Amino acid sequence: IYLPIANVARIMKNAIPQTGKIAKDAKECVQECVSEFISFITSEASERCHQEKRKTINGEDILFAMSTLGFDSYVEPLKLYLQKFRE
Amino acid sequence: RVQELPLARIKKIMKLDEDVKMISAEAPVLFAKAAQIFITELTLRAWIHTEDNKRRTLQRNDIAMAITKFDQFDFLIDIVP
């Protein structure tokens, strides 16, 4: 299970200079990496929820897993995105 | 826009986890934005190796090199060998 390749490729293209090109196998590689990112963070959150005897993975569990595993810089932009999403 | 990412697909990936019971509504939304941040940073770091090799086409080996060089990407060790 992967996010749509066209969405992944669009985000990749926005990151590199306008004259750059991205090979199809690089797009497919990043598609795989994204899914592993989601599963890696989810595994950390799910083990914590299990230990704490809770049945629902909440947003705080995801953000805390990111903070623990080296993605603390994501916490503030994610909170802002979700809040703007809810407004 | 990050809103274009399908939340059902993100939820499906989460649900592969053997210990996931129920998922909050906000969890896939957070992952949608995180996916954009992650793709952008991984792509930029790989592009360092594209240019260092005098190329203008980003290739899979560039991603592999970026993963080895950044501690935050250690978890991709088996994905891009």
Binding site: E36, F40, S43, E47, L69 | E18, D71, F75, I77
Partner: peptide, 15 residues
């Protein structure tokens, strides 16, 4: 900081 989660994910992907 990722090591123990990496080891665990390898086991999950094998299944």
């Amino acid at each position: 900081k990722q090591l123990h989660r990496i080891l665990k994910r390898r086991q999950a992907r094998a299944k």
